Design brief:
Keywords: De Novo protein
CATH architecture: Orthogonal Bundle
Name: Ga98
Number of helices: 3
Helix content: 55-70%
Entry title: Ga98 solution structure
CATH topology: Helicase, Ruva Protein, domain 3
PDB class: de novo protein
CATH class: Mainly Alpha
Radius of gyration: 12 Å
Assembly: monomeric
Number of strands: 0
Number of domains: 1
Length: about 55
């Protein structure tokens, strides 16, 4: 996006936020991932939000 290419964890912070809002989750996740310095930590944690192992 934009002229230059921006790099930031934010992209991942939204990744979880989007998945979290779409399904019953725990805000603590988007806050935990957004705190991660590496995106791989946010995109992975967010993946857990999409599966959540079991449903309730």
């Amino acid at each position: 996006t934009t002229y230059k290419l921006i790099l930031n964890l934010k992209q991942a912070k939204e990744e979880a936020i989007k998945e979290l809002v779409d399904a019953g989750t725990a805000e603590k996740y988007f806050k935990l991932i957004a705190n991660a310095k590496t995106v791989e930590g946010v995109w992975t944690l967010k993946d857990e939000i999409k599966t959540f192992t079991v449903t309730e």
